[PDB]
Amino acid sequence: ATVKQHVQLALSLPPRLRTFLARYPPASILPAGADPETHKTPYQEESPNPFMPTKHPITGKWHNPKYSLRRQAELVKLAQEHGVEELLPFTRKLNEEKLRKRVELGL
């Protein structure tokens, strides 16, 4: 029964989050014995991290991240209210990244 309750928590998230996790699923939620590099998502194959810029191989030009720095904060602020901030990929807007960088280096 606990499994049916968990599936209800994942389907209760906003559609904006469910959509993002569907095309950018982290290795944590993937199957146990599955590998990260294999069975990649068509969105992940284009860019592993949608928040970081990617340099196109054929043309030496950097493509902007699929989600701007403003949109990166809306997902973090939306993922933190539902306790799903651990699934979002690395981002300079993460609450733990903003704090670690301050404590490590400081002003």
Partner 1 sequence: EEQEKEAKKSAAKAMLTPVQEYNRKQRELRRARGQPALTEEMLAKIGEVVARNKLG
Partner RNA sequence: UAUGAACUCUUAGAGAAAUUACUUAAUAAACGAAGUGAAUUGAAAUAUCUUAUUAACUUCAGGAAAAGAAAUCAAACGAGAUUCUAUGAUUAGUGUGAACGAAAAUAGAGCAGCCUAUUAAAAUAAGUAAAAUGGCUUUAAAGCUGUUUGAAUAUUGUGGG
Partner RNA sequence: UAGAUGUGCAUAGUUAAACCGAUCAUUAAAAUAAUGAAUAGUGUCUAAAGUUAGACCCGAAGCCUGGUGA
Exactly one of 1, 4, 5, 60 binds RNA (CB under 7 A); that residue is: 60
Exactly one of 83, 95, 97, 100 binds partner 1 (CB under 8 A); that residue is: 83
User: Mutual orientation of helices 15-23 and 69-80 as an angle, nearest 10°?
Assistant: 110
Contact in structure between 77 and 62 (CB atoms under 8 Å): no
Residues 23-82 contacting partner 1, CB under 8 A: 23, 25, 28-31, 41-43, 82
Query: Closest CB to RNA among 32 and 104?
Result: 104
Q: Rounded to a whole number, what is the largest CA-CA distance in the chain?
A: 53
CB of 99 vs partner 1, minimal distance in Å = 17
Q: Which does 74 bind (CB under 5 to 8 A by kind): partner 1, RNA, none?
A: RNA
Q: What is the DSSP letter of 72?
A: H
Exactly one of 18, 92, 98, 101 binds partner 1 (CB under 8 A); that residue is: 18
Residue 68 burial (CB count, 10 A): 11
Q: Which does 103 bind (CB under 5 to 8 A by kind): RNA, partner 1, none?
A: none
Dihedral (CA of 21, 89, 16, 8) sign:
positive
Backbone angles phi, psi at 63, to 5 degrees: -90, 135
Q: Which range of residues in 1-9, 30-38, 50-58, 81-89 is near RNA by CB under 7 A?
A: 50-58
